[PDB]
């Protein structure tokens, strides 16, 4: 996990390692009941002891609700009064054990205990190496969701009174003996009260802490960090609540006649930024309003304000990593796009509104077969389009979002595939005639679909609705699966796998696409950050030139894997952390042995034991039929699709090995070099090497404005 028995109150992480674990498990062997029952027994194996002690640390509070009491030389007892510090206490020796642990260390230990208790009670997969064989503590941008580099040019011990906004006096030395301890606790309390609910947990790393000095020195002497003290700078790391990551106003207490103590600390904590605003329903409360920006978050703005106010006037604040990430995401050519946040979906919802108007019109048209269903299935309808949909921007390849138009059941369909497609074309012709005769403001034309092989008469209806949007209606009936199964039956033994690929393309276009769309839209609403992560991942694949041969639904699945199963990491709370988690996973993926099994759900319908083992048996059958993977590389499966081939079919083994090699080169780059603007720029530069030839081409017209950026 990354903890240790070291001191954490000096702006460090740890406080809990071998010794604390032994004393704690000895106390839990002694007992630990609410009426001094025993929780762990002598005859238990190490699995039982570990499950018990982690169940205890997950369930019981030891910092804010209660405390534990035992005697070493008769029984242990939990009591229900929190002492605002980690409190396991021995009365036979009158000690508190975990005073090296700060509140943030105990909070992160609580969250890790909950996560590993969940992974212990997980019965479906094998969670063993998932728990014990993945040191996540290597990259701080993969361990914590927001990193902040702040520099503190302090000066000298007597220059403290000028270089600080706080005061380190006599009783301050008594309570917080070392300056590092005092400044660290000051930053924790200031940043915690400033953020409030926009963070789940906090951590303050003191970069530059040398715990070693020679015999000829009185203490650890240094000159780094603009002063003579044992740190280079401060790394402020935040585990962020993603739903309240971007609430615009920071609500405080209400307004009575008397200035309350809480509103007094609010006013003396915000100064000029505070105000008193009357809201839409009529409440009168204090709040400090900010402004959203695409390139940088309100967390950065507020921690800049807080540290430059209540710490010093000399500190420097930075996260250019996430600044450049938000810059690398595209920005649509729309009014107020700059101040627009990254979680805004207003363009998508405007598209959906226009679609619903068209949906009503075509639903109440009059046809020989009445319409049964109309299902939007587009990438914009699942928020995974790369460029956000701009009105009248008709050069983006995702301008025409696919809708399925399905009529009622009828026994009088033709039973010959070409004439069947021609009958669907006849229905679309009547629809187009009625539209151009009734609702002339809409415009329309007809195109072809050659994505399905050997079915060459698939005609789609392009409709341009006057809010600037395009939909290509394609018709799905109750006879397509029947005719494709009959064709693949009557085909001879040589051409059967060709029609297998044909039917599989048909399924992935028409049938499982609808299930895919509704599932991803629902779980995206539960996971906001999935849409910026998948947009950034699609941008990365496009600049590395793999998107032309890898389909967008596979891109979305391989993007959403860490959101669905973030074990043993956390749920991503930044575009940076999400994208780098995706890169680390796709680098560590050994697809020749390991299949991808997902359960696309909201957080705590899941794939139970029988379905899971059946999918794994499908996988091992595929690997017995193909051990090396010259025909299939990625075996991805979910509840809507237990097949395992349907989205990753027809993929060149050069392309798959190139993708895994690019991920490995990327993660080795981040291993050898620190994460910064030059590293991410090198990440986004295209390769253009390992290719036997390259052909550079230009268009006569630049297409940025027409694409809507």
């Amino acid at each position: 996990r990354g903890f240790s028995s070291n001191m954490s109150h000096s702006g460090s992480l740890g406080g809990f390692g071998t010794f604390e674990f032994t004393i704690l498990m000895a106390a839990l062997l002694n007992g630990g009941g609410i009426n001094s029952n025993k929780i762990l027994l002598h005859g238990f194996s190490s699995y039982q002891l570990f499950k018990g002690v982690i169940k205890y640390l997950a369930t019981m509070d030891l910092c804010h609700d209660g405390h534990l009491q035992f005697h070493s030389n008769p029984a242990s007892k939990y009591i229900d009064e929190g002492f605002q510090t980690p409190t396991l206490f021995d009365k036979s020796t009158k000690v508190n054990i975990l005073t090296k642990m700060t509140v943030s260390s105990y909070q992160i230990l609580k969250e890790y205990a909950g996560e590993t208790l969940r992974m212990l009670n997980n019965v479906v997969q094998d969670q063993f190496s998932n728990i014990f064989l993945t040191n996540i503590s290597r990259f701080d941008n993969l361990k914590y969701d927001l990193c902040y580099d702040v520099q503190l040019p302090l000066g000298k011990y007597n220059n403290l009174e000028t270089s600080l906004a706080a005061t380190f006096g006599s009783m301050e030395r008594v309570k917080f003996i070392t300056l590092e301890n005092f400044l660290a606790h000051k930053i924790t309390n200031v940043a915690r009260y400033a953020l409030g609910d926009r963070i789940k947990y906090i951590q303050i790393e003191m970069v530059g802490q040398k715990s070693d000095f020679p015999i000829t020195k009185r203490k650890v002497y240094s000159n780094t960090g603009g002063n003579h003290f044992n740190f280079d700078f401060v790394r402020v790391k935040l585990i962020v609540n993603p739903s309240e990551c971007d609430k615009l106003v920071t609500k405080g207490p209400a307004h009575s006649e008397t200035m309350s103590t809480e509103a007094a600390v609010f006013k003396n904590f915000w100064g000029i930024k505070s105000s008193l605003r009357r809201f839409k329903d009529g409440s009168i409360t204090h709040c400090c309003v900010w402004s959203t920006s695409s390139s940088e978050p309100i967390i950065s703005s507020i921690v800049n304000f807080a540290l430059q106010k209540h710490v010093s006037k000399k500190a420097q604040i930075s996260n250019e990593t996430i600044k450049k990430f938000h810059n690398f995401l595209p920005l649509p050519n729309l009014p107020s796009s700059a101040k627009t946040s990254v979680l805004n979906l207003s363009s998508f919802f405007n598209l959906k509104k226009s679609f619903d108007d068209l949906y009503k019109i075509i639903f109440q048209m009059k046809l020989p077969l009445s319409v049964k269903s109309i299902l939007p299935v587009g990438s914009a309808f699942r928020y995974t389009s790369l460029c956000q949909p701009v009105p009248f921007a008709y050069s983006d390849p995702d301008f025409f979002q696919d809708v399925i138009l399905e009529f009622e059941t009828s026994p009088k369909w033709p039973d010959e595939i070409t004439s069947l497609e021609k009958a669907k074309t006849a229905f679309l012709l009547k629809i187009q005639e009625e539209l151009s005769a009734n609702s002339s403001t809409y415009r329309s034309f007809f195109s072809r679909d050659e994505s399905i092989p050997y079915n060459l008469e698939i005609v789609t209806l392009n409709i341009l609705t006057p809010e600037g949007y395009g939909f290509k209606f394609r018709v799905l009936t109750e006879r397509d699966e029947i005719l494709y199964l009959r064709a693949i039956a009557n085909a001879r033994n040589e051409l059967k796998p060709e029609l297998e690929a044909t039917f599989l393309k048909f399924t992935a276009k028409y049938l499982a696409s609808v299930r895919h769309t509704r599932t991803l839209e629902n779980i995206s609403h539960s996971y906001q950050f999935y849409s910026p992560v998948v947009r950034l991942f699609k941008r990365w694949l496009d600049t590395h030139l793999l998107l032309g041969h890898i389909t967008d639904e596979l891109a979305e699945l391989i993007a959403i894997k860490p959101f669905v199963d973030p074990a043993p990491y956390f749920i991503p709370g930044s575009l940076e952390n999400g994208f780098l988690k995706v890169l680390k996973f796709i680098s560590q993926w050994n697809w020749k042995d390991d299949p991808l099994i997902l359960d696309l759900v909201k957080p705590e319908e899941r794939l139970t034991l029988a379905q899971y083992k059946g999918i794994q048996m499908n996988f091992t059958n595929l690997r017995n039929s193909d051990p090396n993977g010259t025909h299939l590389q990625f075996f991805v499966a979910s509840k809507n699709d237990p097949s395992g081939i349907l989205y990753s079919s027809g993929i060149p083994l050069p392309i798959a090995t190139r993708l895994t090699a690019l991920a490995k080169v990327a993660v080795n780059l981040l291993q050898t070099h620190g994460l910064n603007q030059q590293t991410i720029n090198l990440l986004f530069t295209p390769g253009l090497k390992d290719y036997d030839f390259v052909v550079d081409l230009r268009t006569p017209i630049g297409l940025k404005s027409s694409c809507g950026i």
């Binding site: 194996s45 190490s46 699995y47 019965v123 094998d126 063993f128 014990f132």
Partner: peptide
């Protein structure tokens, strides 16, 4: 089942992490 798989896996990790009497006697 959980008992069997976790027991075999902790046996693997303990034989991986186990130290040596030569180091013990030297120290």
């Amino acid at each position: 089942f959980k008992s069997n798989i976790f027991k075999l896996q902790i046996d693997e990790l303990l034989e991986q992490v186990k130290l040596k009497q030569k180091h013990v006697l030297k120290v």
